[PDB]
C-alpha cells in the first residue's frame, strides 16, 4: 500500500465523474495491456479577468461593459496504473465563468491549456482516452448549466512545455491542421452522444450571432482576443473596430472553436450554476508556472516512461504534503 498514490488523492465530484467515464470505456474495450485511470482535480480557486486599458476606454468607462469578469479556474490531471506504479499522462487547465458572471462571458468555459505525455498503455487507446476525458468534461459542465465551451487549437513552439517539463524528444508536436482535425474528431464524437449541439469556427459563430460590437466577444484570461483588440485599438489610434475584428477572425477562424452545449430557448431559463465541489487552494497547481518551476528545480523530466513515473511520484508527494 502506498500512502502517496494518485488514488488516495482527495476526490472531487468532477474527478470521479471523469474517471468513471474513462474506466467504463476501458472495461468495455477489455484490453489486457491497460490499467486503471485516476482523475483528480488538484486546484480550484476563484479569480477575475481585468479588461485592459484600450478596451476599458472604449467600452468599460462608458458603462457598456463590466470592468471585470469572475471565473473559477481549475487544474486536473489523469493517471494510469502501469504494473503498480502511477503515471501522469494528461493535464488540463480550465476557466469557468459562472451564471453570476456579467455577459458576454456568462455560462462559458475556456480550456486554457492542454498537455500530455505520450506513455499511455496501450498506444492504440491513447487518443480515445484523451477523448473520453475531454468529452466527459463537456458532459459535466453542460449538466450543471454552462451553455458554451471554447478551445484555442494552439500547438506550442519547439521547447515550450505547456504543463509537463521536458517532453520526450520523440513526441511530435502536431501541426495546426492535425490538431484541428483531432479536435473535430473529438467534437464529432460528442455530437453523436448528443452532448454537443454543434460547433463552428469563431468567425462563422460570430456571424450567426449577428455580433456587431467587440464588447459582445467573450473576454478570457490569457486568450488571443483581448490582446488582439488592444493592438487593434492602437492601430485605430495611429490613424471600424468591428471590421478589424471580423477580419482577424476570418484569417484565423480555423484555430478557434466555439462549442455550443445548450442552444435555443433551453438556454434562456436556466437555474443558477452551483459547483458541488469546494475550492481547492493549491499553490503548486495555481497556473502552470509553479509546477514547471518545481520540475526544473528537482530535475524532474517527463521525457521517458521511467523518468515520467519518477516525476509522477514526486508530484504526488508534493501534492499530498501540501494538501496536508
Ligand atoms: O502536443 C502537446 N504537447 C507537446 C507534445 C510534444 C512536445 N515537445 N516539446 C513540447 C511538447 N508539447 C499538447 C499541445 C497541443 C495539444 N497537446 C496534447 O498533448 C494533446 C494532443 C497531442 C497531439 C495531437 Cl495530434 C492532438 C492533441 C494530447 C492531449 C490533449 C491534446
Swiss-Prot record:
Residues found modified as N6-acetyllysine: 52, 189, 215, 244
CBP/p300-type HAT domain: residues covered: 3-324
Assembly description: Interacts with HIF1A; the interaction is stimulated in response to hypoxia and inhibited by CITED2. Probably part of a complex with HIF1A and CREBBP. Interacts (via N-terminus) with TFAP2A (via N-terminus); the interaction requires CITED2. Interacts (via CH1 domain) with CITED2 (via C-terminus). Interacts with CITED1 (unphosphorylated form preferentially and via C-terminus). Interacts with ESR1; the interaction is estrogen-dependent and enhanced by CITED1. Interacts with HIPK2.
Superkingdom to which the source organism belongs: Eukaryota
Region (Interaction with histone): 113-115
Lineage of the species this protein comes from: Eukaryota, Metazoa, Chordata, Craniata, Vertebrata
Species: Homo sapiens
Coiled-coil stretches noted in the UniProt entry, renumbered to this chain: none
Outcome recorded upon mutating residue 73 to R: 40% decrease in activity. 90% decrease in activity
Positions that bind acetyl-CoA: 114-116, 126-127, 173, 178, 182
Post-translational modification: Acetylated on Lys at up to 17 positions by intermolecular autocatalysis. Sumoylated; sumoylation in the transcriptional repression domain (CRD1) mediates transcriptional repression. Desumoylated by SENP3 through the removal of SUMO2 and SUMO3.
Compartment(s): Cytoplasm; Nucleus; Chromosome
UniProt name for this protein: Histone acetyltransferase p300
Domain notes per entry: The CRD1 domain (cell cycle regulatory domain 1) mediates transcriptional repression of a subset of p300 responsive genes; it can be de-repressed by CDKN1A/p21WAF1 at least at some promoters. It contains sumoylation and acetylation sites and the same lysine residues may be targeted for the respective modifications. It is proposed that deacetylation by SIRT1 allows sumoylation leading to suppressed activity.
Its job: Functions as a histone acetyltransferase and regulates transcription via chromatin remodeling. Acetylates all four core histones in nucleosomes. Histone acetylation gives an epigenetic tag for transcriptional activation. Mediates acetylation of histone H3 at 'Lys-122' (H3K122ac), a modification that localizes at the surface of the histone octamer and stimulates transcription, possibly by promoting nucleosome instability. Mediates acetylation of histone H3 at 'Lys-18' and 'Lys-27' (H3K18ac and H3K27ac, respectively).
Primary gene name: EP300
Full-sequence portion shown in this chain: 1285 to 1663 of 2414
Disease named in the record: Defects in EP300 may play a role in epithelial cancer.
